[PDB]
Symmetry: D4
Subunit: 205 residues, 8 copies
């Protein structure tokens, strides 16, 4: 495949005049207040991807942020609860038009309890993802070729998943539930950033 | 302490030309598919309450349902996740303008882990609720005086709580978070009715 | 509260020409292979009770056992799963016409999770039990007056509960469920005696 | 080796004039109120099987239902607690003459804690029911060849297992225990449909 | 309610020419390697008790160890698994003729799951037995009375438990358990205090 | 019981020319990044206390911070792990000469598992602390008299506890262990601020 | 690899004039009141084994029971707590001179938490040992070879464990544990199988 | 892989005039009061290692203990919490200048929850460790000696990488304070608080 590697930001949005963009991030860990954003991966849904290295202390990425702020472009995530949190904490913009394949899976793949990306890709596309050591030093000044190819592999197939999940949501008549969940998802991410990350806010206890 | 007891529905809405109504329900249990709605309690925020007995198999309550559907009137609940579910299952109308004191408590009373109505009322109003008859035969043809007075006691003070919680949400700058949670709450209740009551839909696992 | 205390067997069945008898036992513990049956309590529902002391190693009690075996008389228990097991283990006769107030409670009092006899008597009858002498040497040669009054107190109210539970089962349209559960209960007790006392035989795991 | 695929119902009962029929279902999940029945599999015990796709919203299957209702034909399931529940919820008929290989296993394979169908078939017949997954789109308009072969493999061996388990139940003198458990199993399924699916109705707590 | 308080050791064994002695200890905690022995309580069963305060670092307490070592005198404990361990760690002698009311209760009071001394005394005798700085140089009167209260009733319990063990025909089981109890305490001292040595896992 | 209430800071340090100062804080909750400091309580040990209300967003308290950073004054806390964290987060200065009565209790009161302030005060001093207002609106513009007396009661006794614990630590020869723990405690608090609040950094797992 | 299969009992004790015998059983499960004894395996410590199939309802095995109750012959088990229980339930005789390799492992192999027979044989001997319907009228060859494989190595383990117990100076602890083990099995038969009788709770 | 096996003590410290030494131990188990120290392994960071067999009941090893006591030499451990405890219990000297690769991992490898030595070596070095046994045997096997040496051969390289990572993420003073406290954590273990997080609320 084609993986374009950039420093700081996209040079322009010439490749992203599209209706939906696949988005994924890579960080130093699960705690946005401690673990900085290190890499952002994007795809137009074609056979190529862009991998943008974010520098320590970087506060702005205008072209990327333009994509994240544009309400006419749906941002596709897998477990967007996390990516939205870390992106908003880093760049100050919370996306508000999103689609999450994990929520969609929990709303459609009711016949399994395994909702990870590897399992979804295996069932829906017969594509074998080798998630061998996503645990690596993403803060390295120069990423290895294996790192870049693994990082890119996480976004090349989210569009196809979105198409299938939209078919499943239509088939089982769950469109309005999914729409409301996606509408609330950015506020779930905000609640995480504000300090309620360990609390199911709707639970009795 | 005026408590008006009705069969089936309010006779009219003459007492409910108001901006916010306190609402609470009493059922045979926690499972809306098994445990029917038995009592609905309402208050205008004054010193009186209305207690409406719902008959087995009753499908319609036009004055009550009119109130529940009126988007210009905020419905106040404590743990509305449950009440919304059982009301929508029974009358076919899901309220969409709501305020929940338990979510508000979880967003404001961050210094305690006890968010039940008794504890909230004790701290905020110095009012002692004697929560004893939560387990009684709510399907009895004639409710006892003790049942009616206890049941009414659960709605007389939700307005005062709403006022205080709005003050607290303004003070800690969490108004937009609360507004988004309350906007999503009816769909959380719908998810409960559809079969995800044991699933935190936003959790990783 | 006439309480008749007997050694060994009933003198006759003159007081038990009735359609239903309340039955309850006392042993040295929950494991029938280790903990012997010490006392059998009976009531006809007339406000009096018979308390029959069973001697160590006693294998037969023909009048009592004939009563327990008579299929025209429903035996009322609280948690008959245990009593049926210990009675069959001791006397060699497995009752097959039973009513269990704990199963009935689990099928009707769906608004609570407390199904003990004290709580049931409190809710349904306003009666107050005093379960204190449950930890006593029931194998003592001479039972104390306090032991006798407690033992009788455990059977004096089961008829009134059965009447109320039958009303509730009719009201909630669960009569055939209860009938099938009670029909299966003696085999559940047999399964306990055979060695499956810790296994829910119908569970997936 | 031969799997006949039908839409809606059996064409006739010419192939099922037998003493016992193996039955197995495939659904969208474990919750009968949410997850619809998609594929029913039958087997006369011969080398062929019938696989019937059930359409969304289908309420009747007259030829199939005639076989499910027939008291003269024992229905063999593996974990019939679930299949009985989903069949009754879908077609309104509860079979009442059943044999469950999992209950029989729990009553006979006392030397192991693994009672799944794969392990039973491996131990008792040296037959490998090794599958791909129980997680595919069973609601697909066209089932794949792999899906059809997997669906058929789950019923091809239940007759041989029934024969072996009947021999073992006779050997260890547990025939009446198993018979009573099978007699109660349909009501266990009805209890599941009414809302007690998470409750061991016979447990002390 | 006679309680004799001593420093270090009994003055003599004039009060202990008896068939059975009730014994109880008080320490700084549950871990014999960390928490030193502070008090030893004794009773002849006559309704009086001796309370012997043991100093920090004390390695010997003569005549006391003779009483604990004498195979013709049964030592009665409640949960002796612990007391035997702390005594052996302090004085180097493991008693080997013992009776433990906790084992006896577990072998006879099969109708309850509460085996504490307070509950046993409440059920069997209708007697109400209802920590602190046991290393204080001078014990308070309340401390002395509590320490004595822990030994004043063990003889009556042994009598009742012996009746129950004979009645339910478990005397040889109990006897074998008591015979093994000193080695169980030794195992605790050696490092297996958190391990059920006979369990499969 | 003189209690001096101030806004923002001590007026001067005239009352705090002492060798040890008792320090205790009151916050909106357990999470320093979310729950702000509201009330700081000091006590020279002379039977009087100072209760200082800290305003929302206040970044500076020069007289207080001067006392917090004075290495010639040991700061006494109960569970200083938390107070040190919230003080450093709020005012930017981490005290480095501290004594914690909870660590001292865990190192000395080896005969109990209850190390809360109520149990320590009860055992060591026969003083009854009524901890009933640990959950109130500490951010209120005007504190109630009951709040002020409760807040002061938490610091009035720490000097006497420090004296006793020092005697006990000397008696059992654990002074150097405790001393090293107190030296590490401020870094434990820093670890809490950086995001390792839920991790025992020294545990194997 | 000689395996002699018998019905009911040994024909004689000609092969068992020895100081120690390896013993293992095979049942229908872990609960002696429910799951009957199906097979008893014996070894003299040589390269052969005897596998005795016991019929349902069999009450007597006089030659076998004579061997089991001979106090001059040590019975070696792996997890004898269970086998002793099932043997006593079936034939009414509790062996009282035993060695258990699981207790010995727990007393000597303190560097691991894996005490199964496969792991012990792997570590101590570099031997690879690597259920089924034991009530079948005719056992398969695989069944017979597995049943024999469970007893062929217990003598060598006893030798090694005795070396380790001497080396770490725990011989008397192990001896006391083995002396108590038959009563622990009896306690299991009487109804305390899920209770650690020496535990505080 | 030169591995020198010794009985009782180092013959001298001629090979250990260095600024950091990797140290690891092997015992009969985790409880120092029950399970005696059996082997001590050392490395100078070169391609050789020394494996020193400790006899049962041995209370002193003067050259080795002099090395462990020397404040000018940082002792590198993996999970030094245990090794420090057993060494101090055995020889009476508590090291006070230490580096622990497990604490360093917990402070830097925040993207994983697997902090074992095998995983660390795999991630940081692409080195495959093939990881007990009766270390009290009178004669150790060759396989034992190779396994024992493999645990110290790589700690220097890990320390160098972790020092780079600690500098990069600006956590040097946190790590320094944790390593400074680690010997007292080990002492707390010896006195009886081995199962207690002394800083936890409960």
């Amino acid at each position: 495949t084609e993986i374009r590697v950039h420093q700081g930001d996209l040079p322009n949005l010439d490749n992203y005049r599209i209706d939906a963009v696949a988005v994924d991030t890579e960080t130093l860990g699960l705690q946005p207040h401690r673990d900085r954003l290190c890499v952002v991966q994007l795809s137009s849904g074609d056979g190529t991807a862009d991998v943008i290295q974010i520098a320590k202390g970087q506060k702005s990425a205008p072209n990327l942020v333009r994509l994240l702020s544009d309400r006419d472009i749906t941002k596709i995530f897998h477990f967007g609860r996390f990516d939205l949190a870390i992106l908003a904490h880093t760049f100050g913009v919370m996306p508000d038009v999103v689609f999450c394949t994990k929520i969609a899976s929990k709303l459609t793949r009711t016949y399994t309890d395994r909702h990870g990306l590897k399992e979804i890709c295996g069932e829906l596309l017969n594509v074998n993802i080798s998630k061998q050591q996503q645990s690596s030093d993403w803060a390295a000044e120069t990423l290895s070729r294996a790192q870049i190819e693994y990082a890119a592999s996480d976004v090349l197939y989210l569009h196809r998943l979105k198409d299938i999940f939209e078919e499943r949501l239509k088939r089982e008549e769950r469109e309005s539930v999914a729409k409301a969940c996606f509408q609330f998802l950015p506020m779930r991410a905000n609640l995480d950033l504000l300090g309620w990350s360990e609390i199911d806010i709707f639970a009795h206890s």
